């Protein structure tokens, strides 16, 4: 019978947001987490043990793999999804302490407002900033044959990837769900801008 303490808190945090934004944001988060957590991380299991190159020089594989993948995609998306959800839990833990400060007082405009919109700006700024770095570094497709020109390897070598087609589909999926989570925060911003 002690679960009525949460119905205050979840209603107080969403006090300025529309009804069509609360459910759509919540479902895409669980969707993102499950798709990241059961399907795609097994695809990136043998990312180094299956990477083979066409040479005899010892150590050529270690450097020609490292030039191709300065970071993996599954560790990139975790770094993305943590930075995206930091400001929401910040706002959540802040509102709890503010409610605790006023709860102590009554028995024994613009205060929380600006903090909300600033967090909604920062969530979208981080999202578009992570999209730009992925556009700059990797691209949005993966070829099957890579050409490597590092040391200690000789002149030019060919290396063959591991599942170049299965990774492309999840690349496009994580592009699309990130674009939708950006586009919906834009609408949530314009809904609270146009009230007054």
């Amino acid at each position: 019978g002690d679960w009525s303490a949460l119905g205050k808190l979840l209603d107080k945090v969403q006090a300025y947001s529309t009804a069509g934004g609360k459910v759509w944001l919540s479902v895409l988060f669980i969707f993102r987490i499950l798709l990241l957590g059961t399907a795609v991380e097994s695809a990136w299991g043998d990312e180094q043990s299956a990477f083979r190159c066409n040479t005899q020089q010892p150590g050529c594989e270690n450097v020609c793999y490292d030039k191709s993948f300065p970071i993996s995609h599954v560790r990139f998306w975790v770094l993305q999804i943590i930075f995206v959800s930091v400001p929401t839990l910040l706002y959540l833990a802040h509102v709890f302490y503010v409610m605790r400060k006023e709860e102590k007082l009554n028995k024994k405009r613009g205060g929380l407002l600006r903090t909300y919109i600033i967090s909604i700006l920062f969530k979208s700024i981080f999202e578009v900033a992570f999209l730009l770095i992925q556009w700059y570094i990797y691209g949005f497709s993966l070829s099957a044959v890579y050409t490597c020109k590092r040391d200690p390897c000789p002149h030019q070598v060919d290396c063959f990837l591991s599942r170049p087609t299965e990774k492309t589909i999840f690349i496009i999926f994580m592009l699309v769900v990130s674009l939708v989570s950006l586009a919906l925060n834009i609408i949530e911003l314009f809904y609270v801008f146009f009230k007054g």
Copy 2:
């Protein structure tokens, strides 16, 4: 003593459905999840480490495996079962907020109806759409010997799969349970169409 809050919610969501549909839908979901979760994912463990080909050209195995399996079946069925259950949890989280909006009012026809049938349509549309893509891409059987004609391999090579017979039975099982989940949603649609 705080479990009576769920007896409202589970009764309010199924308010238009028949009694013979609630138990049959619920059992097949748990059946699907357990069969996906303990039996078949261990069969697809060594899907690449056991794939062998009859050649000496380095990198021929990596491309001749990738042409055969543009996506695996166990990652395909997870993508299927998430898209199938997205609209039900959407409807569930929507009804909670609508009940919260009216719960605040009384102490201090066609509204939810159309949203129900639209979700039941979308669940079946997604199911038949995923069946058609599986019919187009793979088939419904797996031979033991594959013939591969890609580059950098020479003219034509033979590759031998891993467990071609054990995968066929689970292919047919996931065909049958998907067909039954389609066929039962059809009856649930026709039951609510023919009232008026």
Copy 3:
């Protein structure tokens, strides 16, 4: 203090059964689950990585293993134990909804009877049907040397299994516990037949 809602449900489901059947069925289920879950699945770990054959033809091992094991025993027993316990949870979820339908009425013979005996028939029919297929396909012992006559292998090859003696004991154990679970359902059927 909200656990008295389960004492109604567990008493209502077993209303026609004897006292000596409820405890014996419940203990063998937990016994089956634990013996399947901690002991025997580690024996079947290296079922393919330890399978070796006496040839040089590439791909001969992949087909000569697949002919010997069209399905594994641990995936067979999971498919058995799910099909065995489907009708009991079906009856359980049905009785909950029937109790919910009559619980709403009083404040604001043969109904459940036939459904019980039909489920008890189906549980035994599935059990004897799975025993017959195992008797037809595999046998009840495993030799140490298999002789294989498939393609692309030449005339006849010898393959050596992995732990032929440790699997036989668990084969006999899963035979015995299945026979006891069959034989006890027979007595539960004859106890309710001979009342009237």
Copy 4:
């Protein structure tokens, strides 16, 4: 506040036992489970991948390993500890149903006695029966070099085990704790025999 239902049940089951037997039996069970569950099962990890033999005949290792270990010790002790604790949970689930049968009556000598002593006999009979089979099959020590005389191997081969010294200490530990659990049940039997 619903935890007072267990204080009836744990007091009713131990109604004939001494105070110095309840704590000593309970501690050795947890000790057995933890020592089986975190320490010794990692020692038996590479029991087949580290087993090497001094021959070139293919398949000689598979049969010469199987003759040496018709069952492993960690799967033997699980089969032991399940059979040991079956009668206690049988008695426990029986007493619950008997209490439920009499709980329904009062508001709206020798009965449980014999069942107790019979279970205490069976627990010790199973314990000494499992000790005798281990004494007959394996011994109580493991040498480092095994000599194997099976087919298809030639005349006599030498095989070298994996950790022959680390397994001996846990063999002696599981001997000692089993002997103590036998010896204490003997005292619990003689304590209830000599009352009258």
Copy 5:
């Protein structure tokens, strides 16, 4: 309804701290734990199985790897994060016992103050001490080629690392979050110094 016992304890422990320090310390802890727990420990999986050296002398790899990595970074950061959070849980368990000692009394300045500031000093001293050792031992970057001059290897050998670029980014991240956790404890110290 028994969760009001924690609202006393979490308010009593933070009685001298500012409001802008409680949320920022709490978020960085969860951030540190998750980034340590799901992303970076998979990068350090194949730290020895992928380490290759350009020699034929047996055992040269074992010593030339060990000279390069006297401890790994992921085991270093766990040793850091335990020593950092020891004094906070010490203070927490101390305040519970002091509250229990005074709770027994009333029905049937500088006491806790000094213990707080001493713990806040020790947390920062440990943090800067761990930063100095990492600055002394390793550096803050990792080259791709190491030169090794130990025994039993001959004159000088070259060894090639595993992912020299992916580790550098997490090195810089764990530098930055540690520097921020140091810099914020400095402000928390100066806030309580300048009151009086």
Copy 6:
């Protein structure tokens, strides 16, 4: 609201102990468990797969490894930490039964005293006994090159260990925390000796 039953039990068990011993014993236990459970057991993962020796005789590695490590350190410390915490949980389960025996009486000096000090003696005796065996068997450092003189190997062989430097630091850490847990039990003994 049923958590007040534990505040009796945790206060009754520590009735003779000082306030500065309860928190320090409790923190070192959690410290020991976590350091054993997440950091050091991954270091001892490849303890046999990375052990290499400089010979061609088959089976020489299996015996020359076994002579060097008659037991591993991580299995030694688990055997230590179970034997250390057996008497405390024995005393804990004993006090519960004694409280249950007197709880039944009142509504419908030296008793527990000696049992406390005897357990505190046994905890320290076991601790110093395990330190002496580790001092006798292994030492407190690990060299990088081992010299082995067993059969079936020839005259003398060299074997190279796996991480000789990373294990030494955790050896010294588990020495230090064990010495502190000994030294603090000595003070707890002298505190209760000198009362009277």
